[PDB]
């Protein structure tokens with residue numbers, strides 16, 4: 369099967385939590401302004417553009433914005449807007465209608481509630497492309513592929529600490545909600561330690577089927593760049609996944625990476641059953 373349409377080949381009845389999904393950390397940090405090129409080794413986390421990542425099989429993206437609706441990496445402008453991102457993602461789903469995309473949307477200045485209101489008009493323009501439930505529904509249950517076909521599962525992260533509610537509909541769910549387990553030890557861990565946490569989280573992910581696992585392979589430190597961690601960790605993660613596939617262990621959750629190589633993404637995909 370093609371990496372461009374790998375989810376379409378999966379059974380409609382499969383739960384989102386039962387899959388091994390390749391994703392990218394700080395998805396848009398593959399280009400940026402002058403400050404971006406000056407701090408390139410510290411800030412860059414990807415080489416492939418958004419459309420290229422989607423075509424390569426990535427189904428989980430990490431978009432970080434500010435109330436001006438532009439994409440940022442802290443104080444660094446990434447030469448992209450949320451509209452441009454939304455249009456790209458939406459075009460991909462229109463072309464490949466069975467795929468689904470998990471999208472973490474973070475506010476870079478978590479000090480304001482103005483982010484929630486400002487993004488609403490833009491998100492509303494693409495309402496037909498978002499997985500949505502009624503406001504009253506607090507079921508929190510993880511959807512089935514049938515329900516998210518050709519749609520975006522939004523994971524909101526901002527000051528309000530609540531899910532994006534536009535009109536009477538609740539858009540996606542809250543990032544960090546009780547139905548998702550997150551491993552995000554980014555703050556300078558040793559390679560050995562980081563690997564243990566990745567492996568432990570993947571192990572726990574296999575035993576459960578009622579929660580979403582966001583397992584970050586990514587990290588930084590004052591003396592080790594994202595590029596350096598990826599070069600050490602990605603291959604180790606890849607071989608671990610290859611092994612588990614032999615033991616018939618599937619549904620490892622969302623493996624969120626920096627600088628993922630095409631072959632690595634394919635092997636994570638192959639962990640699912642077709």
Ligand SMILES: O[C@H]1[C@H](O)[C@@H](O)[C@H](O)[C@@H](O)[C@H]1O
Pocket residue numbers: 393394552554584586
């Ligand atoms: O710099 C970190 C890092 O990128 C983590 O992966 C992300 O989850 C945190 O929100 C962010 O502050």
